[PDB]
């Protein structure tokens, strides 16, 4: 059974990740999101614990969906003859971090700090589960506005985490690191930290720093809004040209700008309910 268990609503959107619909689970009105993808269009595949051929995305979501976290969890999935259907958590009410920033402009540092910490935990969770997301960006982060909680989405560019080099990538070019641009080579964590540097700038300035390849490889970070010296230093650290000069997750979360983070409910009361 599929269209019995889940009542399907309006299309939420569609693109490189397939077609995603609003839905409600009928056994308990749980809000969900239903994501379809054609087998013809899947570029990457894996094998489940059952040992079955599945899109890599299912493999990765299953590894990170154990326990609670800052990731949007996979509740279920069906295979169809020409497609796969994934049933996913949906917060309600929700807005993605890309629209939130467009509507509100550059975020206050205290709020940027709360969001960015939550994204850092969510990514740490992924890495601990052997998953590398490879498309961290504002558009792949949802805000649960009531709870003040950020959740990661879209594992369709992801890979298994490994310590050797990656020579394939197909996430968002503007969040991709200079060693991808110049050599079609990168290592997982160091690339992730670059993306997070781009994300932090996006949060505190209102937009990403670089649009063009030449800008990505030049690593000159002009700040277009007032941003504290501590935050500027963290961002420039994340955006070091040489991968090995970038900070680890630990150095980031121990950086002085990162201290005294608000709790998620505090973040909601102060910055989201009003």
């Amino acid at each position: 059974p599929l269209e019995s268990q889940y009542q399907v609503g309006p299309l939420l959107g569609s693109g490189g990740f397939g077609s995603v619909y609003s839905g409600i689970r009928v056994s308990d009105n749980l809000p969900v999101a239903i994501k379809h993808v054609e087998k013809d269009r899947i570029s990457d595949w894996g094998e489940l614990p059952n040992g079955t051929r599945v899109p890599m995305e299912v493999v990765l979501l299953k590894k990170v969906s154990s326990g609670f976290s800052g990731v949007i969890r996979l509740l279920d999935w069906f295979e169809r003859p020409d497609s796969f259907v994934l049933i996913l958590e949906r917060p309600e009410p929700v807005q993605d971090l890309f629209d939130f920033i467009t509507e509100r402009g550059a975020l206050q540092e205290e709020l940027a700090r709360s969001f960015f910490w939550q994204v850092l935990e969510a990514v740490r969770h992924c890495h601990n589960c052997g998953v590398l997301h490879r498309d961290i960006k504002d558009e792949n982060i949802l805000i649960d506005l009531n709870r003040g909680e950020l959740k990661l989405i879209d594992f369709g560019s992801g890979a298994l985490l490994k310590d050797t080099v990656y020579t394939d990538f197909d996430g968002t070019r503007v969040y991709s690191p200079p060693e991808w641009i110049r050599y079609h080579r990168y290592h997982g964590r160091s690339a992730a930290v670059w993306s997070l540097g781009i994300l932090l700038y996006d949060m505190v300035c209102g937009d990403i720093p670089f649009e063009h390849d030449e800008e990505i490889i030049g690593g000159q970070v002009f700040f277009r809004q007032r941003v504290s010296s501590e935050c500027q230093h963290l961002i420039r650290w994340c955006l070091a040209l040489r991968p090995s000069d970038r900070p680890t997750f630990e150095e980031i979360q121990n950086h002085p700008w990162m201290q005294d983070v608000l709790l998620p409910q505090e973040t909601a009361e102060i910055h989201l309910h009003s």
Binding site: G156, T172, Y175
Partner: peptide, 7 residues
């Protein structure tokens, strides 16, 4: 000129 960026 702010905008989304697909994969």
């Amino acid at each position: 000129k702010r905008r989304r960026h697909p994969s």
